[PDB]
Design a protein around this ligand. Structure first.
Ligand code: CLA
Ligand code: CLA
Ligand code: CLA
Ligand code: CLA
Ligand code: CLA
Ligand code: CLA
Ligand code: CLA
Ligand code: CLA
Ligand code: XAT
Ligand code: BCR
Ligand code: PQN
Lengths: 120, 74, 75, 41, 180, 160, 735
């Protein structure tokens, strides 16, 4: 939801060169872009899902052996989180921002549906 | 259960029927008290029962019974 | 089943119908019960086959549900 | 509400709920996209 | 079983590459309905050798223009077979007979259930003493080179077929074989 | 074209069918009054009929001599949206259903009262298994490889 | 109460009427008779075979005599397309004047002949009511021969032993070569000598046959090797059958297709066919070993056929002794082959009519196809029933097993669960989806939107039609192409005749097909698979199951195993046959309904009626049954009657017998025993009737007997009502 909210705000502002990528409205951009770019995103997200969870992808398969902190993919290239004191605060901030972004992603999508122009 | 069934019959007569139109023309309007939703092409079941109404013709005689009861309004 | 068949055919053939303004009575089937309900072939043809015409020709009309239920009840 | 939820977990109630939900989303797909003889794509 | 067979190298880690576990389905349920690993390896060698020969046979005639004298000058593998089938029927008949004889002598039918006197792609056939006297590791390395080149030729021929069927499937292909 | 059929966009009998259906619907529409709900319903019927006929015309659909869309299910991808894509969709959904059913049967089969958990479903475990069926093609070709998909000789056999 | 079941003392001691009922139904089960040996079994079967062939020949002689005496064969010769053949005259005292007038044909009331014997006898060269009489005389003589042989081979010095009966190689050599090849050779001789000139106006009878050359060159080309001379100058395209106008001199040709006038196969084509078949079968009859040291020993052939890798177990090692020592295995094989053969006859005698003017005889076409398909279903069910009987009473696991490993037949009982499960899966698959598509079409058409129908073009079957030369589906495949090697190869032999016939809208050769054909073929496949499932399940489960692991100890036919273990109704293998008879009747009904409706639409010209209405069930019910039943039911009305009155009476009779079968099937015993006890008390306690008492105690029919009687009523009513419907509908619709 956070990535998708940022995607809305950037899409209506920046956009890519080309006739396909010329819709400030995210909902209408979902249709104008066509199925080919979207299906590639779907397949890439699937590849990511497979490799990040290392095969065990389902509710019964994941956490079957334990030893898996929920949400812990080990992704930390920039090194933020070495200090354990701020780690808990960062986790809480991520959770709160994620919830707020779920609410906001619903809000933006439904604004685009009831008005049709953009978010602004 | 029987009372619920009777309540359903009376509710259909009140809301999804041409009872008022049938009262003014009993001999030329066919009693109908069930309209069919327009899905999968099933709306053809809504027949020309008369009285500016579309629905399934009713053969349970509720319209005649209600008229015999003196019921003149939905 | 025999009772309701007797009722349906007898009423349609010898009670129900229309009355002309001069008083002439014309029935739904035309009085065929008296002479054709006395044989099993008569029941098969002049009642079952004859009055089943409306059920089999109901497709595309508002009575098509009756044809569908006819087939489903056979099934 | 401990045995009522167990009653709702019985085979008939669960099958009725699942079939009602299934018929519901089928009927609503056929309402919003009616007369679909072939795959939309 | 795959750990002690030629075919895996650094390109796929150090383990035998088998995402679908097709090498271990022979031991599964049924007396035999799925091929043994020996049959799969013989299919490896046969398909790879055929693919290498076919790559040479689409490159040399079609591009370089070299042709057998009394044969049609068709730089197209989708029509050359029929063109030679009509132009020189005797040559194609003899080629088919030679192929049938070679395969019948080197029959691999006991490989389906595992077993047989031969090895995977043994075939004898060492005229110019390339493996006359060599270490076992050297022979294994040469076999691995052959298998990998066969896989590469398989990929190249599949790319040829795909580009002929679906245009633009291999982007660099027409820029790497400028003539048909 | 295929099998002597012709595209429905150029089938005269198809357009005759459309015209006859529309004419019947309009004749039915004539016997009602003004913007009354019956007329609205009949107009919606006419609009839906026209939309359906137009969509069938522009759908790579082959029509016979009766002006009805015929399905080409020999396997060609040209008419792949008629059978092949719905076939894949059903195979996915039905494999999902079968996989979740089998997983639930095998999961509650190792508890103290396996038969009780079949008339009174463990809704938490049922929900856990059901949403895990999206990987049924992968789960099936990961349990067959391990030999956990097929029984061998504990299965019972009759006397002969 | 004694001496009737002479073959069974257990039945003869029954004090009830069950002894009489079971005496009839066990008379031909010779293996179960008292004081029974194998030699007596084979000898009695041999004599019964002789009596049976005598009965067949007497039946054919009766048909010939009644056509010669009361028919109009000679009149039908001069006008085969307008004169309706007469089977036999009618003398029934119950006729009124109206019935006499309606059935009156020429001089006496008579029945039209729907057996197609007129066309068959006309084709083989019969032109006189004295030719038919000669055939009847000869066939009665042959029947006398067979009866004498049957009596003779029960005499002491002429009764064959078991070794002679089980001499497989000798019987195969003789049957194949002698029976098939030599009978085909003699039939080619007759075809040429008599039939070929008779179709060209030259009469070749039992007087001028030693002096009338079948070919002008006269056996010179055959010995000289110039066999092409027999094919030169065939019948032209303007040849009038039975007349010399436009005829030829050839006797063995390839022409393909049909005669331009009779719309039937060329007589020279069929003579060549039978000559080739004769040569092939005579050659194939020398395969097996006899007293001259060369040939095959089939025991060795069967034993040596074990795949080396090993997937059929030990192969066919124990099959020779298994088949030889069992008469039910051989009977099942013969019945299966005969069922396939008569299915072939039905499927080919309508697409490739072999008899002159038979294509235009629509009622006889329908009657022949229906008759042969019903016989085919009966034969197939009998084959499977006798396979089950072999499993119950003749199968020996020790013979079919060598050192633990099982042979090809014994392994069928190891994966029996797999076979039954997959038959069940196929049946459920086909039924679910055929019914789903049919009901989808029903609902969609009923709602007034036929465009939403699911109509699958039978491309696979249309592909086959194009492969044989039909240029209707634009496939350009093998014979639809003039450049394919398949066409260039026969462009000079039989394509011009074959292509001219396959690409013709008036033929039944490769009838054009559509989505309705697809759906009905899937229905036929479902019926075949379900009947096979029932029969195979009964055969494999005959020796036992989980519910009855000792079913072999109770025999092929027993009522049940009791109400214990949850209930064991219809658990015997006989009950599987009994259940599969309904499915066979249903499948044959579907096949015959499809054939008859397709051909009624083809003959009437409204083939668009079938192509549109055959995709949904109400289409069938309204346009086949309800539509074509109108002429039949009006065979007699309160106003009069027609010659179709007998067919309406048979229609009602079939319905009545069907519902009496319903009686015997729904209501079981126990309810009929107490009622019979009440009747017994009433008879015993009434004056003026106490003077009369039964000798056999009246009891209710047994469970198995009741099932058989209900099945017999069901089947007889089914057959009678459908025969009446098809015949009367064809006659009353197509003039
Ligand atoms: C259980 C399955 C199911 C699902 C997934 C939906 C889904 C939906 N329904 Mg719905 N609906 C269902 C069953 C279901 N319905 C049933 C059983 C009824 C009663 C017969 C309704 C009556 C109903 C109404 C009256 C409306 C919806 C509407 C809607 C849509 C917006 C909410 C959505 C597509 C709304 C819609 O989209 O209409 C504009 C709307 O107005 N539904
Ligand atoms: C078993 C055979 C069978 C098959 C293959 C079909 C197939 C079809 N029927 Mg049908 N039907 C059948 C039996 C069958 N029916 C029976 C027995 C009846 C009688 C009750 C009907 C009554 C019927 C009607 C009344 C209608 C259909 C319609 C349809 C079509 C639209 C399907 C649909 O809603 O897709 C859309 C829905 C889905 C694809 C559901 C799956 C979606 C999931 C949620 C995807 C999620 C995962 C990603 C389709 C071609 C409709 C039509 O338009 O016909 C052309 C229509 O109006 N059928
Ligand atoms: C003819 C096709 C074919 C077949 C039969 C095989 C078979 C084999 N390969 Mg192989 N391979 C192939 C093509 C093929 N390969 C190609 C084109 C490449 C280049 C990408 C490779 C690259 C490769 C590597 C890198 C390795 C193997 C290995 C193996 C062995 C174990 C895996 C197995 O059982 O696969 C069975 C495969 C099949 C039955 C083929 C099914 C293909 C289906 C139809 C899908 C194809 C389209 C997608 C086995 C002998 C491993 C090995 O040698 O272990 C020691 C190993 O390490 N192969
Ligand atoms: C029924 C088919 C059949 C069978 C059982 C055999 C059997 C044999 N062949 Mg052989 N062969 C066949 C067809 C067959 N052939 C055909 C069509 C050709 C091409 C002309 C050859 C060419 C051939 C050569 C060149 C040689 C053999 C050899 C052999 C022998 C052992 C080596 C071997 O199998 O490798 C050869 C294996 C094959 C050629 C594979 C053939 C696969 C066939 C075509 C598949 C048919 C199966 C199919 C389901 C049948 C349908 C049945 C029905 C529906 C019609 C063995 C006796 C060798 C020999 O003589 O040893 C001394 C040998 O050198 N075969
Ligand atoms: C040449 C010598 C000869 C001949 C002519 C016969 C003839 C006959 N024997 Mg016989 N027999 C012989 C030698 C011979 N036998 C010897 C040497 C032995 C001792 C070893 C026996 C032992 C023997 C026994 C024990 C019995 C007979 C029986 C019979 C009769 C079989 C019933 C019948 O009428 O079939 C007539 C059949 C035809 C005219 C031909 C049938 C045509 C078929 C159905 C068509 C097939 C075409 C095609 C293949 C269909 C498939 C299509 C294709 C594409 C696959 C028949 C008359 C039986 C009988 O009834 O006894 C009285 C019997 O029980 N025989
Ligand atoms: C070297 C010895 C020899 C050769 C080459 C021939 C060759 C021939 N003989 Mg012959 N013949 C021979 C010795 C020989 N005969 C002897 C020793 C006798 C007995 C003394 C005969 C008696 C004989 C007769 C009676 C006839 C022939 C005929 C023929 C011819 C018919 C062949 C044919 O088309 O098959 C025909 C194929 C079949 C009949 C079935 C296959 C053929 C040219 C026939 C003929 O008319 O020749 C012109 C003929 O009627 N032969
Ligand atoms: C040439 C073929 C052939 C042969 C030789 C046999 C021979 C045999 N069968 Mg068999 N069978 C056959 C075909 C054959 N069958 C077919 C086609 C079927 C499937 C229908 C069967 C089904 C079958 C079963 C299920 C059983 C046998 C049994 C038997 C054995 C005892 C027969 C007996 O007791 O008769 C008894 C004869 C009768 C009871 C007479 C029945 C007459 C029927 C009801 C028709 C009469 C009505 C008639 C049409 C009236 C017309 C009505 C009018 C108003 C129009 C015997 C070895 C039995 C056995 O124990 O085998 C070991 C057994 O259980 N068979
Ligand atoms: C119209 C009547 C009718 C119907 C629909 C069936 C249907 C069936 N019979 Mg059946 N049967 C019937 C009459 C009928 N029978 C009669 C009169 C007899 C004589 C006693 C038999 C004797 C019989 C035997 C002996 C066997 C069957 C079998 C079957 C199944 C075959 C597989 C199949 O088609 O699955 C598809 C199922 C259907 C199309 C019907 C049910 C589908 C409904 C409409 C779903 C609705 C959901 C809401 C199926 C359930 C066989 C079986 O069990 O195979 C597994 C089997 O062994 N039947
Ligand atoms: C995300 C969301 C919807 C996202 C939709 C998307 C992406 C749709 C994409 C598409 O449409 C397009 C673009 C094109 C279509 O053709 C295809 C699809 C692909 C379908 C809705 C969220 C919807 C989110 C909703 C409705 C949230 C409701 C939250 C409530 C009520 C919270 C209440 C509380 O927070 C308070 C008020 C106080 C707290 O203390 C207590 C509680 C009770 C927790
Ligand atoms: C139970 C049992 C039994 C019985 C069984 C049965 C009854 C079976 C049946 C069977 C059957 C009934 C089978 C069938 C078969 C068939 C087939 C096998 C066919 C084939 C065909 C073919 C192969 C063809 C081909 C072709 C084509 C397609 C085209 C044209 C040409 C040709 C020829 C090539 C017995 C007694 C034995 C024993 C015991 C057990
Ligand atoms: C009606 C019926 C009866 C009663 C029918 C009986 C007892 C048959 C009555 C006699 C019939 C009508 C034949 C009568 C023949 C004459 C008496 C002449 C004698 C002929 C014999 C010598 C062969 C059963 O016994 C029965 C048993 C099990 C399941 C279902 C049923 C069942 O449905």
């Amino acid at each position: 939801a956070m990535l998708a909210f940022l995607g809305f705000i950037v899409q209506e502002f920046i956009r890519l060169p080309g006739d396909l990528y010329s819709e400030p409205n995210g909902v209408k951009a979902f249709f104008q872009v066509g199925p080919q770019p979207l299906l590639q995103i779907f397949l890439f997200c699937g590849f990511l899902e497979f490799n990040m969870h290392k095969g065990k992808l389902t509710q019964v398969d994941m956490f079957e052996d334990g030893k898996r902190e929920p949400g812990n993919f080990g992704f930390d290239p920039l090194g933020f989180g070495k200090d354990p004191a701020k780690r808990e605060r960062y986790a809480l901030a991520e959770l709160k921002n994620g919830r707020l972004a779920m609410i906001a992603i619903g809000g933006l999508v439904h604004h685009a549906l009831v008005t049709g122009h953009a978010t602004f | 259960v029987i009372f619920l069934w009777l309540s359903g019959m009376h509710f259909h007569g009140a809301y999804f029927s041409n009872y008022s139109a049938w009262l003014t023309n009993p001999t030329s309007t066919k009693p109908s008290a069930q309209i069919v939703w327009p899905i999968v092409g099933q709306e053809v079941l809504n027949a020309d029962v008369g009285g500016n109404f579309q629905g399934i013709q009713i053969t349970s005689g509720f319209f005649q019974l209600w008229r015999a009861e003196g019921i003149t309004s939905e | 089943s025999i009772v309701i068949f007797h009722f349906s055919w007898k009423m349609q053939s010898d009670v129900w119908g229309t009355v002309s303004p001069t008083g002439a009575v014309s029935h739904i089937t035309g009085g065929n019960f008296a002479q054709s309900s006395i044989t099993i072939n008569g029941w098969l043809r002049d009642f079952l086959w004859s009055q089943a015409a409306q059920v089999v020709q109901s497709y595309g009309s508002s009575l098509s549900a009756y044809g569908l239920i006819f087939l489903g009840a056979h099934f | 509400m401990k045995d009522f939820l167990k009653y709702l977990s019985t085979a008939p109630v669960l099958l009725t709920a699942w079939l009602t939900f299934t018929a519901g989303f089928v009927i609503e797909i056929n309402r919003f996209y009616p007369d679909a003889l072939t795959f939309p794509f | 079983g795959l750990e002690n067979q030629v075919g895996f190298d650094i390109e796929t880690g150090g383990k035998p590459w088998d995402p679908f576990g097709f090498a271990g389905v022979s031991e599964r349920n049924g007396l035999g309905i799925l091929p043994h690993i020996k049959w799969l390896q013989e299919s490896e060698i046969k398909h790879g050798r055929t693919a290498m020969l076919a790559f040479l046979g689409v490159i040399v005639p079609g591009s370089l223009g070299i042709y057998v004298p009394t044969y049609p000058q068709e730089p197209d593998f989708t029509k050359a077979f029929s063109a030679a089938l009509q132009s020189n029927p005797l040559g194609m008949a003899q080629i088919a007979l030679a192929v049938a004889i070679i395969e019948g002598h080197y029959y691999a039918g006991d490989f389906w259930t595992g077993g047989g006197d031969r090895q995977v792609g043994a075939f004898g056939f060492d005229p110019l003493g390339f493996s006359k006297g060599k270490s076992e590791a050297a022979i294994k390395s040469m076999q691995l080179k052959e298998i990998k080149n066969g896989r590469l030729a398989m990929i190249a021929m599949a790319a040829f077929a795909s580009e002929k069927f679906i245009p633009g499937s291999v982007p660099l292909l027409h820029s790497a074989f400028p003539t048909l | 074209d295929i099998g002597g059929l012709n595209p429905c966009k150029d089938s005269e009998v198809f357009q005759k069918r459309l015209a006859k259906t529309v004419k019947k619907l309009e004749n039915r529409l004539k016997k009602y009054e003004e913007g009354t709900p019956p007329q609205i319903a009949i107009q919606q019927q006419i609009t839906q009929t026209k939309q359906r006929f137009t969509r069938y015309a522009d759908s790579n659909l082959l029509c016979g001599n009766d002006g009805l869309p015929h399905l080409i299910t020999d396997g060609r991808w040209s008419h792949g949206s008629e059978f092949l894509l719905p076939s894949i969709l059903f195979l996915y959904i039905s494999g999902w259903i079968g996989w979740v059913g089998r997983k639930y049967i095998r999961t509650v089969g190792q508890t103290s009262n396996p038969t009780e958990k079949e008339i009174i479903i463990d809704v938490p475990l049922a929900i856990s298994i059901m949403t895990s069926g999206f990987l049924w093609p992968f789960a099936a070709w990961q349990e067959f490889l391990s030999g956990d998909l097929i029984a061998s000789d504990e299965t019972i056999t009759t006397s002969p | 109460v004694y001496k009737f079941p002479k073959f069974s003392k257990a039945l003869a001691e029954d004090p009830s009427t069950r002894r009489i009922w079971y005496g009839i139904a066990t008379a031909h089960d010779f293996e179960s008779h008292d004081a029974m040996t194998e030699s007596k079994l084979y000898q009695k079967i041999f004599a019964s075979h002789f009596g049976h062939i005598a009965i067949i020949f007497l039946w054919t002689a009766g048909n010939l005599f009644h056509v010669a005496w009361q028919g109009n064969f000679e009149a039908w010769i001069l006008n085969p397309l307008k004169v309706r053949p007469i089977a036999h005259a009618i003398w029934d005292p119950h006729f009124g004047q109206a019935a006499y007038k309606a059935f009156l044909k020429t001089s006496s009331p008579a029945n039209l002949a729907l057996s197609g014997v007129y066309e068959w006898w006309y084709t083989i060269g019969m032109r006189t009511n004295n030719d038919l009489y000669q055939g009847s005389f000869f066939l009665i003589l042959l029947s006398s021969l067979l009866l004498f042989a049957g009596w003779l081979h029960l005499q002491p010095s002429f009764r064959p032993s078991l070794d002679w009966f089980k001499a497989n190689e000798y019987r195969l050599n003789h049957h194949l070569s002698g029976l098939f090849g030599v009978s085909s050779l003699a039939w080619t001789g007759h075809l040429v000598h008599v039939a070929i000139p008779e179709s060209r106006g030259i009469h070749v009878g039992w007087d001028n046959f030693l002096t009338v050359l079948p070919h002008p060159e006269g056996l010179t080309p055959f010995f000289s090797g110039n066999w092409k001379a027999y094919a030169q100058n065939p019948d032209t395209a303007s040849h009038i059958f039975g007349s010399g106008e436009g005829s030829g001199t050839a006797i063995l040709t390839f022409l393909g297709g049909f005669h331009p006038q009779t719309k039937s196969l060329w007589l020279t084509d069929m003579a060549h066919h039978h000559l080739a078949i004769a040569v092939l079968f005579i050659v194939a009859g020398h395969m097996y070993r006899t007293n001259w040291l060369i040939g095959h020993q089939m025991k060795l052939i069967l034993e040596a056929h074990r795949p080396p890798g090993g997937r059929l177990g030990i192969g066919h090692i124990g099959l020779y002794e298994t088949i030889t020592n069992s008469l039910h295995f051989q009977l099942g094989l013969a019945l299966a082959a005969l069922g396939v053969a008569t299915s072939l006859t039905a499927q080919h005698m309508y697409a490739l009519p072999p008899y002159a003017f038979l294509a235009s005889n629509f009622p006889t076409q329908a009657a022949l196809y229906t008759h042969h398909q019903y016989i085919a279903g009966f034969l197939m069910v009998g084959a499977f029933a006798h396979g089950a009987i072999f499993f119950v009473r003749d199968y020996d696991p020790a013979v079919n097993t060598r050192n633990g490993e099982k042979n090809v037949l014994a392994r069928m009982l190891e994966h029996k669960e797999a076979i039954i499960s997959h038959l069940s899966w196929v049946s459920l698959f086909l039924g679910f989806h055929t019914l789903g598509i049919y009901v989808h079409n029903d609902v969609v058409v009923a709602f007034g939107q036929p465009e939403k129908q699911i109509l699958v073009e039978p491309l696979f079957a249309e592909w086959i039609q194009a492969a044989s030369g039909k240029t209707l589906y634009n496939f350009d495949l093998l014979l639809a192409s003039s450049n394919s090697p398949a066409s260039v190869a026969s462009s000079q032999l039989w394509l011009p005749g074959w292509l001219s016939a396959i690409n013709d809208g008036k033929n039944s050769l490769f009838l054009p097909i559509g989505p309705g054909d697809f759906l009905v073929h899937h229905a036929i496949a479902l019926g075949l698979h379900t009947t096979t499932l029932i029969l195979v399940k009964g055969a494999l489960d005959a020796r036992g199951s989980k519910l009855m692991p000792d079913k072999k100890d109770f025999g092929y036919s027993f009522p049940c195993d009791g109400p214990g273990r949850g209930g064991t109704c219809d658990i015997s293998a006989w009950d599987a046959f009994y259940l599969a008879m309904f499915w066979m009747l249903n499948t044959i009904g579907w096949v015959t309904f499809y054939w008859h409706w397709k051909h009624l639409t083809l003959w009437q010209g409204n083939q668009v009626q079938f192509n549109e209405s055959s995709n949904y069930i109400m289409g069938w019910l309204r346009d086949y049954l309800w539509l074509n039943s109108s002429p039949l039911i009006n065979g007699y009305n309160p106003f009069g009657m027609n010659s179709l009155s007998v067919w309406a009476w048979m229609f009602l009779f079939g319905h009545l017998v069907w519902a009496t079968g319903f009686m015997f099937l729904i209501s079981w015993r126990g309810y009929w025993q107490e009622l019979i006890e009440t009747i017994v008390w009433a008879h015993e306690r009434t004056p003026l009737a106490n003077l009369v008492r039964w000798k056999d105690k009246p009891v209710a029919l047994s469970i198995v007997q009741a099932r058989l009687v209900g099945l017999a009523h069901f089947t007889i009513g089914y057959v009678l009502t459908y025969a009446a419907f098809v015949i009367a509908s064809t006659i009353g619709k197509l003039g």
